[PDB]
Protein backbone atom coordinates (compact mmCIF):
# COMPACT_ATOMS: atom_id res chain seq x y z
CA UNK A 1 0.00 0.00 0.00
CA UNK A 2 2.79 2.38 1.18
CA UNK A 3 0.15 4.76 2.62
CA UNK A 4 -2.20 2.70 4.83
CA UNK A 5 0.10 1.19 7.46
CA UNK A 6 1.58 1.85 10.88
CA UNK A 7 4.79 2.99 9.19
CA UNK A 8 3.00 5.96 7.61
CA UNK A 9 1.55 7.01 10.98
CA UNK A 10 4.98 6.77 12.61
CA UNK A 11 6.50 8.82 9.78
CA UNK A 12 3.83 11.49 10.28
CA UNK A 13 4.47 11.63 14.03
CA UNK A 14 8.23 11.89 13.51
CA UNK A 15 7.68 14.59 10.87
CA UNK A 16 5.57 16.55 13.38
CA UNK A 17 8.32 16.31 16.01
CA UNK A 18 11.04 17.28 13.51
CA UNK A 19 8.90 20.23 12.42
CA UNK A 20 8.86 21.34 16.06
CA UNK A 21 12.63 20.94 16.48
CA UNK A 22 13.42 22.79 13.24
CA UNK A 23 11.13 25.63 14.31
CA UNK A 24 12.87 25.72 17.71
CA UNK A 25 16.33 25.85 16.09
CA UNK A 26 16.81 26.02 12.30
CA UNK A 27 20.54 25.43 12.87
CA UNK A 28 19.60 21.85 13.76
CA UNK A 29 17.97 21.51 10.33
CA UNK A 30 21.11 22.94 8.72
CA UNK A 31 23.36 20.54 10.66
CA UNK A 32 21.14 17.56 9.82
CA UNK A 33 21.23 18.36 6.12
CA UNK A 34 24.98 18.92 6.17
CA UNK A 35 25.23 15.49 7.78
CA UNK A 36 22.70 14.21 5.27
CA UNK A 37 20.41 11.21 5.48
CA UNK A 38 19.30 8.52 3.01
CA UNK A 39 17.68 10.05 -0.07
CA UNK A 40 14.72 7.65 0.20
CA UNK A 41 13.39 9.87 3.00
CA UNK A 42 13.71 13.10 0.98
CA UNK A 43 10.14 13.20 -0.47
CA UNK A 44 8.85 12.12 2.95
CA UNK A 45 10.62 14.88 4.86
CA UNK A 46 9.94 17.54 2.23
CA UNK A 47 6.21 16.79 2.14
CA UNK A 48 5.73 16.12 5.86
CA UNK A 49 7.77 18.96 7.38
CA UNK A 50 6.63 22.52 6.58
CA UNK A 51 9.88 23.89 8.07
CA UNK A 52 11.91 22.75 5.03
CA UNK A 53 11.32 25.94 3.04
CA UNK A 54 14.22 27.33 5.11
CA UNK A 55 16.46 24.67 3.52
CA UNK A 56 16.67 26.86 0.40
CA UNK A 57 18.71 29.33 2.45
CA UNK A 58 21.67 27.04 3.16
CA UNK A 59 21.50 24.91 -0.01
CA UNK A 60 23.90 27.32 -1.84
CA UNK A 61 26.31 26.90 1.07
CA UNK A 62 25.86 23.11 1.05
CA UNK A 63 26.52 23.02 -2.71
CA UNK A 64 29.83 24.84 -2.14
CA UNK A 65 31.17 22.03 0.07
CA UNK A 66 34.15 20.02 -1.24
CA UNK A 67 32.56 16.67 -0.38
CA UNK A 68 30.85 15.09 -3.38
CA UNK A 69 28.22 13.42 -1.18
CA UNK A 70 27.15 16.76 0.30
CA UNK A 71 26.70 18.23 -3.18
CA UNK A 72 24.71 15.17 -4.29
CA UNK A 73 22.45 15.51 -1.26
CA UNK A 74 22.04 19.25 -1.89
CA UNK A 75 20.98 18.57 -5.49
CA UNK A 76 18.43 15.91 -4.51
CA UNK A 77 17.07 18.02 -1.63
CA UNK A 78 16.71 21.02 -3.94
CA UNK A 79 14.87 18.87 -6.49
CA UNK A 80 12.33 17.70 -3.92
CA UNK A 81 11.91 21.23 -2.52
CA UNK A 82 11.38 22.62 -6.02
CA UNK A 83 8.68 20.00 -6.52
CA UNK A 84 7.10 21.19 -3.27
CA UNK A 85 7.72 24.97 -3.19
CA UNK A 86 7.85 26.36 -6.74
CA UNK A 87 8.98 29.90 -5.95
CA UNK A 88 11.31 32.40 -7.68
CA UNK A 89 13.94 31.81 -4.98
CA UNK A 90 13.60 28.08 -5.68
CA UNK A 91 14.11 28.80 -9.39
CA UNK A 92 17.24 30.86 -8.68
CA UNK A 93 18.71 28.09 -6.52
CA UNK A 94 17.83 25.54 -9.23
CA UNK A 95 19.66 27.68 -11.79
CA UNK A 96 22.65 27.74 -9.44
CA UNK A 97 22.46 23.95 -9.14
CA UNK A 98 22.41 23.45 -12.91
CA UNK A 99 25.34 25.85 -13.28
CA UNK A 100 27.29 23.94 -10.61
CA UNK A 101 26.53 20.64 -12.38
CA UNK A 102 27.80 22.05 -15.67
CA UNK A 103 30.87 23.48 -13.95
CA UNK A 104 31.98 20.30 -12.23
CA UNK A 105 31.17 18.19 -15.29
CA UNK A 106 34.54 19.54 -16.46
CA UNK A 107 36.19 19.23 -13.04
CA UNK A 108 35.36 15.66 -12.03
CA UNK A 109 37.27 12.70 -13.38
CA UNK A 110 35.52 9.70 -14.93
CA UNK A 111 34.98 7.85 -11.65
CA UNK A 112 33.87 11.05 -9.93
CA UNK A 113 31.63 11.85 -12.92
CA UNK A 114 29.89 8.48 -12.56
CA UNK A 115 29.55 8.84 -8.78
CA UNK A 116 28.14 12.37 -8.99
CA UNK A 117 25.82 12.01 -11.96
CA UNK A 118 24.18 8.64 -11.28
CA UNK A 119 22.20 9.89 -8.20
CA UNK A 120 21.71 13.49 -9.35
CA UNK A 121 20.48 12.89 -12.91
CA UNK A 122 16.88 11.89 -11.90
CA UNK A 123 16.81 15.17 -9.95
CA UNK A 124 17.02 17.03 -13.27
CA UNK A 125 13.57 15.66 -14.12
CA UNK A 126 12.18 17.46 -11.07
CA UNK A 127 13.71 20.80 -12.11
CA UNK A 128 12.13 20.40 -15.54
CA UNK A 129 8.77 19.57 -13.94
CA UNK A 130 8.91 22.61 -11.66
CA UNK A 131 10.57 25.12 -14.02
CA UNK A 132 9.92 24.92 -17.78
CA UNK A 133 12.30 27.93 -18.25
CA UNK A 134 15.11 25.51 -17.32
CA UNK A 135 14.37 23.33 -20.38
CA UNK A 136 17.10 24.96 -22.48
CA UNK A 137 19.81 24.80 -19.80
CA UNK A 138 18.92 21.28 -18.65
CA UNK A 139 18.78 19.86 -22.18
CA UNK A 140 22.06 21.59 -23.06
CA UNK A 141 23.67 20.15 -19.92
CA UNK A 142 22.25 16.71 -20.73
CA UNK A 143 23.67 16.92 -24.26
CA UNK A 144 27.08 17.87 -22.84
CA UNK A 145 27.03 15.00 -20.31
CA UNK A 146 25.89 12.53 -22.96
CA UNK A 147 28.62 13.59 -25.38
CA UNK A 148 31.29 13.37 -22.65
CA UNK A 149 30.07 9.92 -21.65
CA UNK A 150 29.90 8.74 -25.27
CA UNK A 151 33.53 9.82 -25.65
CA UNK A 152 34.42 7.89 -22.51
CA UNK A 153 32.59 4.84 -23.88
CA UNK A 154 34.58 5.11 -27.11
CA UNK A 155 37.82 5.29 -25.09
CA UNK A 156 37.76 1.59 -24.15
CA UNK A 157 36.31 -1.66 -25.43
CA UNK A 158 32.87 -2.34 -24.00
CA UNK A 159 30.64 -5.36 -23.52
CA UNK A 160 27.59 -3.41 -24.78
CA UNK A 161 28.93 -0.49 -26.92
CA UNK A 162 25.90 1.88 -26.88
CA UNK A 163 27.50 3.98 -29.66
CA UNK A 164 26.50 1.44 -32.32
CA UNK A 165 22.98 0.90 -30.98
CA UNK A 166 22.14 4.54 -31.76
CA UNK A 167 18.48 3.95 -32.61
CA UNK A 168 16.96 2.03 -29.70
CA UNK A 169 13.30 2.36 -28.79
CA UNK A 170 12.15 3.03 -25.23
CA UNK A 171 14.07 0.24 -23.47
CA UNK A 172 11.93 -0.16 -20.37
CA UNK A 173 13.18 -2.34 -17.52
CA UNK A 174 23.59 -5.95 -14.10
CA UNK A 175 27.30 -5.59 -13.29
CA UNK A 176 28.06 -3.44 -16.32
CA UNK A 177 30.69 -0.84 -17.08
CA UNK A 178 30.21 2.51 -15.31
CA UNK A 179 30.31 4.42 -18.60
CA UNK A 180 27.61 2.44 -20.40
CA UNK A 181 25.54 2.61 -17.20
CA UNK A 182 25.88 6.39 -17.13
CA UNK A 183 24.98 6.59 -20.83
CA UNK A 184 21.84 4.54 -20.19
CA UNK A 185 21.03 6.76 -17.20
CA UNK A 186 21.31 9.87 -19.40
CA UNK A 187 19.01 8.27 -21.96
CA UNK A 188 16.50 7.29 -19.27
CA UNK A 189 16.40 10.73 -17.64
CA UNK A 190 15.93 12.37 -21.06
CA UNK A 191 13.07 9.93 -21.69
CA UNK A 192 11.50 10.83 -18.34
CA UNK A 193 11.83 14.55 -19.09
CA UNK A 194 10.18 14.11 -22.50
CA UNK A 195 7.36 11.85 -21.23
CA UNK A 196 6.53 14.29 -18.43
CA UNK A 197 6.35 17.12 -20.96
CA UNK A 198 4.18 15.05 -23.34
CA UNK A 199 1.95 13.14 -20.86
Amino acid sequence: DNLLCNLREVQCLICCLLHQMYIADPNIAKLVHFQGYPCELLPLTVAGIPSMHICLDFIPELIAQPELEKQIFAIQLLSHLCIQYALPKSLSVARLAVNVMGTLLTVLTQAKRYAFFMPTLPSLVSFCRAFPPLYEDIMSLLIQIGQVCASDVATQTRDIDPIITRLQQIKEKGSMDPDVQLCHCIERTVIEIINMSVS
Partner: peptide
Protein backbone atom coordinates in the same frame (compact mmCIF):
# COMPACT_ATOMS: atom_id res chain seq x y z
CA UNK B 1 59.61 39.92 4.43
CA UNK B 2 57.81 38.35 1.46
CA UNK B 3 59.66 35.00 1.42
CA UNK B 4 57.45 33.49 4.12
CA UNK B 5 54.59 32.80 1.64
CA UNK B 6 52.07 34.17 4.16
CA UNK B 7 49.12 33.77 1.80
CA UNK B 8 46.29 31.29 1.21
CA UNK B 9 45.89 29.43 -2.08
CA UNK B 10 42.70 30.21 -4.03
CA UNK B 11 40.73 27.22 -2.74
CA UNK B 12 37.83 27.63 -5.13
CA UNK B 13 36.24 26.37 -8.32
CA UNK B 14 35.10 29.38 -10.37
CA UNK B 15 31.57 28.37 -11.36
CA UNK B 16 30.65 29.23 -14.94
CA UNK B 17 27.26 30.62 -15.91
CA UNK B 18 26.91 28.26 -18.89
CA UNK B 19 31.41 35.13 -8.01
CA UNK B 20 30.21 31.85 -6.53
CA UNK B 21 32.83 29.13 -6.18
CA UNK B 22 33.12 25.62 -4.76
CA UNK B 23 35.59 25.45 -1.89
CA UNK B 24 38.42 22.94 -1.47
Amino acid sequence: GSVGKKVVQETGIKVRSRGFQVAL
